[PDB]
Chain A
Amino acid sequence: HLDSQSRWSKVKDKVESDPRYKAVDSSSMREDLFKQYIEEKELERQARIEASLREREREVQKA
């Protein structure tokens, strides 16, 4: 149960033994992935429609 408050030190102390973490051959890459993760499709389609709506809105609002 990791969130923005969670640190990579506890992830290293509780997820290191997992073979999935062993697939990442770089510790810096693992830390960057943890930071990215700390900060099902049709609704995603509606999300892209919303994205188009907001980009059109910002463009027209600036003009």
Chain B
Amino acid sequence: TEDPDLPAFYFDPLINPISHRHSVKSQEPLPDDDEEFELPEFVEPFLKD
């Protein structure tokens, strides 16, 4: 990249685009009378800062 103004990570036009959507995730349809998963209070991604 001959331009420092460009972000260090960016989808270059030279890189060919990726195709459309597909998602086979057939989880059990939950009968929803429940409280689901929750992370602890002080949990965050590793390098949020």
A residues within 8 Å of B by Cβ? 48-49, 51-53, 55-57, 60-61
The number of chain B residues touching the other chain, given as a range, is under 10
Listed from nearest, the 8 A-B pairs whose CB atoms lie closest are A52-B5, A60-B13, A52-B3, A52-B6, A57-B13, A60-B14, A49-B5, A48-B5
| Interchain CA distance A41-B13 in the complex, whole Å | 27
Question: Which residues of the partner chain B approach A48 to less than 8 Å between Cβ atoms?
Answer: 5
Contact residues in B for A61 (Cβ distance below 8 Å) = 13
Write the residues of chain B forming the contact surface with A, with a CB cutoff of 8 angstroms: 1, 3, 5-7, 10, 12-14
SS of B interface (majority):
loop
Residues in B with CB closer than 8 Å to A49 are 5-7
The main secondary structure of chain A at its interface with chain B is helix
A53 to B14, CA, bound (A): 12
- In the complex, which residues of chain A have a beta carbon less than 8 angstroms from the beta carbon of B5? 48-49, 51-52
Separation of A41 and B31 alpha carbons in the complex (Å): 51
A56-B1 Cα distance, complex, nearest whole Å:
9
